[PDB]
Amino acid sequence: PKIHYRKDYKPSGFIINQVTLNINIHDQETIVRSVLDMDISKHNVGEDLVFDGVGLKINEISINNKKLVEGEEYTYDNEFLTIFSKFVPKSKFAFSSEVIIHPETNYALTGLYKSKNIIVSQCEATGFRRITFFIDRPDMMAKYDVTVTADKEKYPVLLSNGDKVNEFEIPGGRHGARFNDPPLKPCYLFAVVAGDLKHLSATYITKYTKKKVELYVFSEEKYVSKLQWALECLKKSMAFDEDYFGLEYDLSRLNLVAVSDFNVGAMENKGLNIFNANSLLASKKNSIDFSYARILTVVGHEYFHQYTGNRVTLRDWFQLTLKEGLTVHRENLFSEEMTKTVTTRLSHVDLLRSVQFLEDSSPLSHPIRPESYVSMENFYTTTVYDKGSEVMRMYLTILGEEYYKKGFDIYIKKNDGNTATCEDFNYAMEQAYKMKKADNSANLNQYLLWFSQSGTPHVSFKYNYDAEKKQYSIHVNQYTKPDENQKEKKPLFIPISVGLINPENGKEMISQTTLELTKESDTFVFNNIAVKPIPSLFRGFSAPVYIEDQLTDEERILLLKYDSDAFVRYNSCTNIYMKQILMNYNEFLKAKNEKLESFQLTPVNAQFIDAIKYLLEDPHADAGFKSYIVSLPQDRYIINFVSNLDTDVLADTKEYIYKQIGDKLNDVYYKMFKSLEAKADDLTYFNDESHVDFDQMNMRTLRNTLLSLLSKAQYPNILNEIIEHSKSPYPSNWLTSLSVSAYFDKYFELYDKTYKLSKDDELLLQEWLKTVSRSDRKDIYEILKKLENEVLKDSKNPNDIRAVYLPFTNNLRRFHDISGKGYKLIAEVITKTDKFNPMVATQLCEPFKLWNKLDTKRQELMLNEMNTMLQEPQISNNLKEYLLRLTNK
């Protein structure tokens, strides 16, 4: 099993200048003819010519139109084509090949494959080698001339990168289209699409050069009515890149295409972006609210790649976070500006501190620029993407908007049209840093540690106030736990956005301030501080760290009520909850361990409950924010703070705390559920697909959150509200009515009712599957078996498989059943999926990521299932490598 090392990067001994492809799609096979115009590079040392080529059936290969013969002149082992150097020309030459591939049975969804009745490619990272021979690495830049042919009736729409320069009929009911794409690109940005596609289109005029850009969004005919929001999102994306970054689209056309079978959300192939249908298609009748932010995010993300990834590309795959962290950051700026809701930023933090922090404290922990890899398909992690985006965001926090924009433009101007590394970006930011600090001595050398050092830093605080001196001190300490990547962790450049709140009137006591912590510890002193403040720390979540604020619950309540920063308010709430959770957890644990006949639990702080009521009853407070304060922290966040976590004890702990708060606030919750109805469920724009109101969707989130709390509590006659809710036109509402009805005898009636509403829309049915999967049912294992037999069956669609099983794995009480039956079940699904789609099989391993954080019995149960999966004779490279790293084998 070959390990690739970052330190080992060396340029190729060859050059590929021109790619000319003929892709001939037939019923039982696809024939790919390729001519590569090549040359010898300055780094060449007379080596064999070795192409990547995986699963290809060779008809013939040639050099300069002379047929090569197997054994004497070349070898092929289904992975590498090796042409012996004595037969490799010493100057410019042409290599040609004809291979047969089989998209119809390509269920791994990499290379060229069939999704329903659409032929589509997915080449990032190393998929182009599954289509034809190539030196499949992103620093091999070439020009592409691509012809596609196919049955005209089955495949009337043909697409590839660049301009369509010819269309022609072919005897036998076939037809062809030729696409020429002169600008250099890496092969992972190649794409082809063939199918009976329908479209919506628009013309966009660029802000400065006034170029007309044709925008096309495509789907199968059945779902063409779900394309409108995507087209709007694309127009929004283009405008934002223009307005914030001064960047215009450079091509005459941009196509977006939805397909049903896709391993991830979408892919940024140049001028031809390809999407999981669940991240492009929506309608108000057939989609839950979450779809609208999802499409905005994913469309935005692939568009922003056109600069950060496509025009400025990667030298090698170790630089992945340079395009992904940066593009996620750009998409976050975009979405925050489009939604105008504080919950956008909060949702990203919530995801980072649960999922990414868990990864970073797991055996899988890696820095955002790893030192090695075995599987590129396993490389696309929340660390690289989401911690990457926070590292990219910190530059903006450090520099401020004006100088950040200056640095970013330096990066784009200097590297446009070329490959780049993480150092190039840091260099550009450093120039802006020098400008900002007004001295050419300033540098960001220490900042590079964010790329190389793994683990989550812990930042802790102590305070001092001298009333006579009016002098306030913040003592700050950072620490990163040693792990397998660094025995000794170095201090990072940590920017700490801070405010000081006057506790008597809630007002700001200082101007905007970002502390630059660059040592293991520092003391920051403030003069003329008239009264002892409450510090507002890491505003906007200004660094990806564990925050230990060392504040009392009284101080945290004051911030929650009166601070100006949404994240600090939310975090203060989070911290109050965590203190309660840890306390009650240990009390339940003791009772379990000692087999106590009686014991005491510490109640929830009454002033905290009062503060929640205060905020809920404030008509000017934000609905989305309100939904966060009545929800306990995610389980995957909590587990970062507890050793040997007993999931049953945690379930009892959460139950107690929710019941404590509900016993006081349920009447408030109910009053709000009712008073919010009018605005939340307003139908005025239900048939306008371009009208999207993120505040109104947040009101529905709040209502559905409250309905869940009230239902669990068996609030008097709440079943009436549930039934009425099931009749709402909004799928977010009537799917919610299904999951909250879990606690009542009407569950299977709503099950059938909502299934009937869902079954005739592919994506809606998948949302229904998720709702059933995450239902809080005691008979959930029987229900999953029912889903398997009646709906899922032997579908190889990753959306179907993920919908049925992943939400269930978040059922704390049931998935972690002490019998191990839940672990057994998902391991069986992983092994089954691994036979046809290793990438998705590895995704389905996600619940096992915390295995060594659980109680010893559950660790053993999980470890056993992973060892069982590892012993399967037919285990994929993906799954084997992943489980070996996860189990520390």
Ligand SMILES: CC(C)(C)OC(=O)N[C@H](C(=O)NO)c1ccc(-c2ccccc2)cc1
């Ligand atoms: C959600 C968000 C938008 C952040 O990301 C995604 O939807 N897609 C990613 C991505 O970065 N798109 O730009 C992405 C991730 C992985 C692949 C891949 C890698 C190997 C093989 C096959 C596929 C391909 C794409």
Ligand SMILES: [Mg+2]
């Ligand atoms: Mg093959």
Ligand SMILES: [Mg+2]
């Ligand atoms: Mg299907």
Ligand SMILES: [Zn+2]
């Ligand atoms: Zn991306």
